[PDB]
Design a protein around this ligand. Structure first.
Ligand SMILES: Nc1nc(NC2CC2)cc(-c2cccc(Cl)c2Cl)n1
Length: 154
């Protein structure tokens, strides 16, 4: 089994918008915006909705930039995460019950308080190189195996 999940990174020249998750799974980490994809909708439809609800932003075009499956040792279910880049948006970022948004300069991204994988795939996302990966975790904080390829090489 895989759980279908969406993640959106809103980017401007030199900076990325992240949100501090205030509750639930991954509470206390900065991340992009997203969540579960419901049965009967597309991955993209979920992403647009969840961005608006969590950050206040409406996006025109979402660019598909990555797909990573995550496995946790000792656990059955995988997370299938679909990652998008937004280069333009309407509205202004604002705190919601789920997320507190904040801009970070690209040389100041707080990787030590993000999911452990972000530091490894962020450079591909920032360079607009579409990618595919597979990560195996030992608990929430330790990466046992990480694999990443640009899809151009497959
Ligand atoms: N950056 C990043 N890294 C992740 N790494 C996997 C160890 C969990 C998972 C997620 C993610 C994406 C969408 C929704 C949810 Cl709930 C999550 Cl947790 N994001």
């Amino acid at each position: 089994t895989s759980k279908l999940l969406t993640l959106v990174l809103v980017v401007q020249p030199g900076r990325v918008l992240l949100g501090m998750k205030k509750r639930g799974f991954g509470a206390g980490k900065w991340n992009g915006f997203g969540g579960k994809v419901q049965t009967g909708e597309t991955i993209e439809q979920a992403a647009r909705r969840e961005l608006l609800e969590e950050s206040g932003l409406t996006v025109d075009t979402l660019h598909k930039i990555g797909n990573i499956k995550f496995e946790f040792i000792g656990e059955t279910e995988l997370m299938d995460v679909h990652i998008f880049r937004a280069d333009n948006y309407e509205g202004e970022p604002a705190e919601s019950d789920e997320m507190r948004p904040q801009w970070f300069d690209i040389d100041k991204i707080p990787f030590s308080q993000m999911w452990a994988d972000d530091i490894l795939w962020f450079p591909l996302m920032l360079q607009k190189k579409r990618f595919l990966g597979y990560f195996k975790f030992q608990g929430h904080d330790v990466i046992v195996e990480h694999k990443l390829d640009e899809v151009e090489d497959l």
